């Protein structure tokens, strides 16, 4: 089958500027390429088809160029809710097939996580088990380290994290930290804190609960 | 208005077989080309086929010959798609779309996409939890923990607050899925006003609204 | 990325018995599962497709079973022709991806090292250096310890030790033992002593050159 | 007959890049799937990625994402496998293989496998020095300081076969360094001739050394 590389696996970029996406063909295929936007958790966008004609509703700021083997997507006046995955596609021969698909990433000065800490709810209890949640929201760049500690030791086991993509709005990060222990267990002990460590931090970011 | 109506998830054992439905309504259901795409979970799109209902001609893929199986209910205006000896391999989403070119504009129309997980385990719905805090501006949140298979929509105050709002992905741990959701809010809001979160798992017919009680 | 793990790393049988060895998959696979061998310094070859069916010129002496996740590699009539590292594949998912390989072994009774010196060669001494080259060939169990004696004196630098596999004929094991002086060296010393300690003999094998 | 030819070995300094080639006979070269394997020295089976040459559909390994690239020469029926930007992790055998099924038997061919090493350091020729001393007499064979690998040993042209052992290559002191030993009937050595045939074909060498008694 025909292979559409996309070279770049991210594009970076600021608001306001403009990017450019490449996507080569192994074949000759004229101008039957279309190129898609998939959005986090959405269905993929049609953007462009017949290599340069936008699908109704697509703003003028998406453009396509390229005939033959080597084609182009220009995305000018670049918004933080152009965040996505860009996938082209060719439809000159069969079976159709689609570009392995470039982020958008978008710079940023960075900024400091807000930090949040909740203890176990009282619902939760009464199903024997306890989760301590930490919020880490809108901080740049992505890296970012999270220690759990029990009365001042540092715990490891039953943690999981997890980081959302680029805000949509501020093009920052965020991430939530929960440890999960039993019921028992969590009442083993009294002090409970998730520290935070970034690029920002001149000194680690501590929130803590005492049970 | 031209709609695609898919199944939000299937949940479907190793080796047996799953017929993923698209709905199409409003629209000439014989008139256009029927598309279907699977997305693996972090990978990218591929094409599996199209079948055109008005006499169900196919365009099969190679990779897809033996495993999907294009078909069209014409007295209902859905068109199905058949995956047999189902794979770890064939856990993915699976989109129906169609398009539109009717002499001035050309338009898309994709289905919301059917997630189907080929595993083992049961279903399981999930328990939502409640983060209220012990400044201008407070973070309240939500523990959406121990459901499967994917996936749970999460929102809140029935989607009237979205902006603040940070809802994290799901991670696997022991066959179940666990995602948190938090949303911050003036003082002037919380408590004084009720803030809810409304958790959907629509593999369970699950539909819990938790408010954030101080 | 599908995972095949294989529980041994080494399988053990007698000339003529019968090996298995498993390989466990993180996912389904169905029946799209690959066997391969590989003797030492050649390219891999194919034993099994589908699990269970066999490439053109393998014996039915190899038979593959296994549906799902288990899948099992059964060698009958064991040779030391066979004597190889076996490897699990996947060709269900993409990343294709491999086992951690299970190296045969066969059992036999014990046998003593046959011992051989060589003083370094008149080529060699040219070049400023001198090797002396003791090879202890065709002993079991793999286990063997050399030592090197100049004079009496116990060498245990400047020495380079190679042991080969399993020998695909006696299934023996062999190994190459090379202490390199300089010349200078070499010929400030007269007696140059090979000592092995075997399991064969409570007293070590001896073979020594007096240069005088 | 078929045939998937590959050089021995390539030498490339870290950083640097370097190009496998695959050269295919004796069957219809855009027919097959044209496969790929990695194996570190002592190490396991690792799947780069395969090539179809009839148009140069590709599927890649993630790990060798942007490091390997397959391309295929059809003037020539070469296949192709550039490496870029070498680290010493890349210092392995590289395999290309087919798989043919012909409506009848299903056979696989394998090209000898290159040895590409990563390193700084030059080549160097191996010294091949003779190793000469009842029923059976044994002879032997130095092959002494050479880089990089590998290297090849017969004994006769490959006549003289039962009775050899052939030890693997230890680095040493930025060197490799090999030995063999042949057992023969007394009646044989010193009477007829045994010659040592060393092949390095990373610096073009190929000596005949042989076992004089002296
Ligand atoms: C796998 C998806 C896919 O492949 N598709 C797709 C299907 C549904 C929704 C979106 C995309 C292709 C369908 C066919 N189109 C052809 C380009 N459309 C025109 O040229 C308009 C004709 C105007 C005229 O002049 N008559 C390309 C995308
Ligand atoms: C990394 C190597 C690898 O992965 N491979 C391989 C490639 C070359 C040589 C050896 C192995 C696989 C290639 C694909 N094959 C698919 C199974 N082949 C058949 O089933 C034949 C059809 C029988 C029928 O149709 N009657 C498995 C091995």
């Known amino acids: ?211 | 208005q031209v709609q695609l109506q898919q199944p939000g998830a299937e949940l479907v054992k190793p080796g047996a077989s799953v017929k993923v439905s698209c709905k199409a309504s409003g629209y000439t259901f014989t008139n256009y080309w029927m598309y279907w795409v699977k997305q693996r979970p972090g990978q990218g799109l591929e094409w599996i086929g199209r079948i055109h209902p008005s006499d169900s001609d196919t365009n099969y893929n190679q990779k897809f010959k033996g495993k999907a199986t294009l078909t069209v209910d014409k007295s209902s205006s859905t068109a199905y798609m058949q995956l047999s000896s189902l794979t770890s391999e064939d856990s993915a989403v699976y989109y129906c779309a169609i398009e539109i070119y009717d002499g001035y504009n050309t338009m898309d129309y994709w289905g919301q996409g059917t997630s189907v997980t080929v595993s083992s385990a049961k279903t399981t719905p999930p328990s939502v939890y409640p983060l209220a805090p012990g400044n201008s501006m407070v973070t309240l949140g939500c523990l959406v923990k121990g459901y499967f298979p994917e996936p749970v929509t999460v929102t809140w105050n029935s989607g009237s607050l979205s902006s603040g709002v940070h809802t994290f992905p799901a991670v696997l741990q022991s066959d179940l899925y666990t995602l948190s959701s938090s949303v911050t809010v003036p003082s002037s809001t919380w408590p004084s006003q009720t803030v809810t979160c409304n958790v959907a798992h629509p593999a369970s017919s699950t539909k819990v609204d938790k408010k954030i009680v101080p």
């Open chain 1, 1 to 211: 089958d025909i292979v559409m590389t996309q070279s770049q696996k991210f594009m970076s970029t600021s608001v306001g500027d403009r990017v450019s996406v490449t996507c080569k063909a192994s074949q000759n295929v004229g101008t039957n390429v279309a190129w898609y936007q998939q959005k986090p958790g959405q269905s993929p966008k049609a953007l462009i088809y017949s290599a340069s004609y936008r699908y109704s509703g697509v703003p003028d700021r998406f453009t396509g160029s390229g005939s033959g083997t080597d084609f182009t997507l220009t995305i000018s006046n670049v918004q933080s809710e152009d965040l996505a995955e860009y996938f082209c596609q060719q439809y000159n021969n069969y079976p159709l097939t689609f570009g392995a698909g470039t982020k958008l990433e978008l710079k940023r000065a960075d900024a400091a996580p807000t930090v949040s800490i909740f203890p176990p709810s009282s619902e939760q209890l009464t199903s024997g088990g306890a989760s301590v949640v930490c919020f880490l929201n809108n901080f740049y760049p992505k890296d970012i380290n999270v220690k759990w500690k029990i009365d001042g030791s540092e715990r490891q086991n039953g943690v999981l994290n997890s980081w959302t993509d680029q805000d949509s709005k501020d093009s920052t990060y965020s991430m939530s930290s929960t440890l999960t222990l039993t019921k028992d267990e969590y009442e083993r002990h009294n002090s409970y804190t998730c520290e935070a460590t970034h690029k920002t931090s001149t000194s680690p970011i501590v929130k803590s609960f005492n049970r």
